[PDB]
C-alpha cells in the first residue's frame, strides 16, 4: 500500500500523521497494480 | 609562434569547467552568506524598550543546517528533492546571539532562532555543496543541475 | 534512453550492432569504419546509430 | 533580508514593550521574538 526513498512497502490506514514507520522517511509511493494491463503496441 | 583556435579553445573550455557554468548567482550568495547578512544585523545594533533599564545587543549571526519542523514541531533534516517533492521550503533557520543589557550591564550571550532562510542550491550552506555525482545520484538529481 | 530500436528511415535492425560498434570505437577504431564492417549500408540508417545518446544510465538510477 | 529583519526587531519592539506591564526580573530572554515573522515575509 506504500513505499518510500530506498525500501519497502507499509499497510494501509492512518490517524496521526504520515511518515514511512520502516524508513522515518517522509514521502510514500502507491506501487502500480499487478493486475492486467493492455498496452496497445502502436 | 602562433597560438592556432584548438589550443585557444582548450584555455575557455578549462575556464568553463574549472570555474562554474551560472555560479553568478552562486558567487553572490556565497558573499551574503558570510560579508553580508552580518551587516544587517550590526548595523542595527540593539532594539527598544520604551523602558530605558533593559536593552539588547545584537551580535553574530550563524547560519544552521537546512531542516524542517513537520507536524506538531519535528526538527527533521532536509534534502532539496525533500522539498520539492512536499511543496516545502528549501531553508535553514538563523540563529543570533543576543545580549540583555540591563541598568547598563550585559547579562550573558544567548543563541536563539530568528527565522528561516531559504537557502540557494549548490551554495555554500546547501547541503549539495561538496558532493559527488553518486550522492547527488543518491540524493534523487542529476549531476548535470 | 537505449538505441531507437531497430532504425527509423530505414526500420531494420541496429539495435542488435550496439555494444560491439561501441566497444570498437572505444578502442580508437573509427566508427566511419566499424560501421562498414557491420551492416552499415545506407547513411539513414547510420544515423540512427551514430548520433544516439543513452540517456537512460542516468534514468534508471533512480525508479 | 534587511526590511524583513526590520520587521522582526520592530515586532519584537512592541512585544518586549507590551509584555512588559504583565516588570519581570529572571526575564531571562526571549520567548517574544516571534520568528515567522522574518520568515513570512522572506518566503511570501
Ligand atoms: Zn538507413
Not at chain 1, 494501509?12 to 499487478?34: D, F, M, N, Q, W
Not at chain 2, 570555474?19 to 560579508?35: C, E, M, P, T
Not at chain 2, 507536524?71 to 516545502?88: C, H, K, S, T
Amino acid at each position: 500500500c506504500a513505499k518510500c526513498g530506498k525500501e519497502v512497502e507499509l499497510d494501509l490506514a492512518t490517524a496521526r500523521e504520515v511518515r514511512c514507520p520502516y524508513c522515518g522517511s517522509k514521502i510514500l509511493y502507491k506501487p502500480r497494480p499487478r493486475v492486467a494491463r493492455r498496452v496497445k503496441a502502436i | 609562434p602562433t597560438l592556432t583556435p584548438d589550443e585557444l579553445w582548450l584555455v575557455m573550455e578549462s575556464y568553463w569547467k574549472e570555474k562554474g557554468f551560472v555560479r553568478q548567482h552562486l558567487d553572490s550568495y556565497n558573499a551574503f552568506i558570510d560579508h553580508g547578512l552580518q551587516d544587517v544585523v550590526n548595523e542595527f545594533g540593539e532594539v527598544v524598550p520604551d523602558i530605558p533599564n533593559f536593552k539588547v545587543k545584537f551580535g553574530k549571526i550563524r547560519i544552521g543546517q537546512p531542516e524542517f519542523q513537520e507536524a506538531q514541531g519535528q526538527r527533521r533534516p532536509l534534502y532539496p528533492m525533500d522539498a520539492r517533492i512536499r511543496n516545502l521550503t528549501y531553508s535553514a533557520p538563523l540563529y543570533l546571539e543576543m545580549i540583555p543589557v540591563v541598568n547598563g550591564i550585559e547579562q550573558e550571550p544567548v543563541e536563539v532562532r530568528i527565522g528561516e532562510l531559504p537557502i540557494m542550491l549548490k551554495s555554500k550552506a546547501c547541503r549539495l555543496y561538496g558532493l559527488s555525482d553518486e550522492e547527488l545520484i543518491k540524493l534523487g538529481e542529476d549531476p548535470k543541475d | 534512453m537505449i538505441v531507437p530500436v531497430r532504425c527509423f528511415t530505414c526500420g531494420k535492425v541496429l539495435a542488435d550492432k550496439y555494444y560491439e560498434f561501441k566497444k570498437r570505437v572505444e578502442a580508437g577504431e573509427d566508427p566511419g569504419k566499424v560501421l562498414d564492417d557491420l551492416g552499415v549500408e545506407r547513411y539513414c540508417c547510420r544515423r540512427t546509430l551514430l548520433s544516439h545518446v543513452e540517456l537512460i544510465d542516468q534514468v534508471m538510477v533512480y525508479k | 533580508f534587511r526590511v524583513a529583519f526590520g520587521q522582526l526587531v520592530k515586532d519584537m519592539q512592541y512585544q518586549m514593550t507590551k509584555t512588559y506591564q504583565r516588570e519581570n526580573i529572571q526575564r531571562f530572554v526571549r520567548n517574544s521574538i516571534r520568528p515567522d515573522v522574518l520568515s513570512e515575509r522572506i518566503e511570501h
